[PDB]
Amino acid sequence: PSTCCLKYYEKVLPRRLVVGYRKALNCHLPAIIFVTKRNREVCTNPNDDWVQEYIKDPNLPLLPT
Amino acid sequence: YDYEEARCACPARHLNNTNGTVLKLLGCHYFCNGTLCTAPDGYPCYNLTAQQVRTLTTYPNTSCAVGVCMKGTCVKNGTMEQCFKT
């Protein structure tokens, strides 16, 4: 799993923009990566409450790499 | 959506290693959506010579100088480990 995050997006990503997510926890900076409709990859803090809320949403899929 | 916050918040490819330690960036910079980004101070990195980079393979044969990013310079700490690409 060779791709890891170096900085967190510190604000709440609008949920409308999010297509799915990937986990990148086995990294120096563990992160949840959200992928947007514009196919941007956004690193986020797994400790933020909104991040955990999004990933537990059954409508929001885990994306294979 | 905040384009400034997101700009350098994309994942980057790291080099792997044979000894179980954290994955490290080649150098202290990475690309995100056409922006050149700088790793944060403290980030783990490898400081490779020009010829080490050119001959770096997927095969573990390069003895790679570990460092710590400081102001965008990979400051060697004296540790060596075998690193390779993916």
Author numbering:
A (entry chain B): 14 to 78
B (entry chain A): 15 to 100
Q: Which sentences from the paper describe this structure?
A:
Evasins are chemokine-binding proteins from tick saliva, whose application as anti-inflammatory therapeutics will require manipulation of their chemokine target selectivity. Here we describe subclass A3 evasins, which are unique to the tick genus Amblyomma and distinguished from “classical” class A1 evasins by an additional disulfide bond near the chemokine recognition interface. The A3 evasin EVA-AAM1001 (EVA-A) bound to CC chemokines and inhibited their receptor activation. Structures of chemokine-bound EVA-A revealed a deep hydrophobic pocket, unique to A3 evasins, that interacts with the residue immediately following the CC motif of the chemokine.
To understand how class A3 evasins achieve chemokine binding and inhibition, we purified and crystallised complexes of EVA-A bound to human CCL7, CCL11, CCL16 and CCL17, and solved their structures at resolutions of 1.51–2.01 Å. All four structures display the same fold and 1:1 stoichiometry. In all four chemokine complexes described here, the N-terminus of EVA-A is in contact with the chemokine N-loop. In the EVA-A:chemokine structures, the side chain of the chemokine CC + 1 residue (Tyr in CCL7; Phe in CCL11, Leu in CCL16 and CCL17) sits in a deep hydrophobic pocket within the evasin structure, possibly enabling the ~35° rotation of the chemokine relative to its position in class A1 evasin complexes. To verify the contribution of the CC + 1 residue to affinity, we mutated this residue to Ala in CCL7, CCL11 and CCL16. Surprisingly, CCL16(L19A) exhibited only slightly reduced affinity for EVA-A. Thus, we conclude that the preference of EVA-A for CCL16 over CCL7 and CCL11 is because the aromatic residues in the latter two chemokines are energetically disfavoured, a phenomenon known as negative selection. Here, we found that the preference of EVA-A for chemokines with aliphatic CC + 1 residues results from negative selection against some chemokines with aromatic CC + 1 residues.
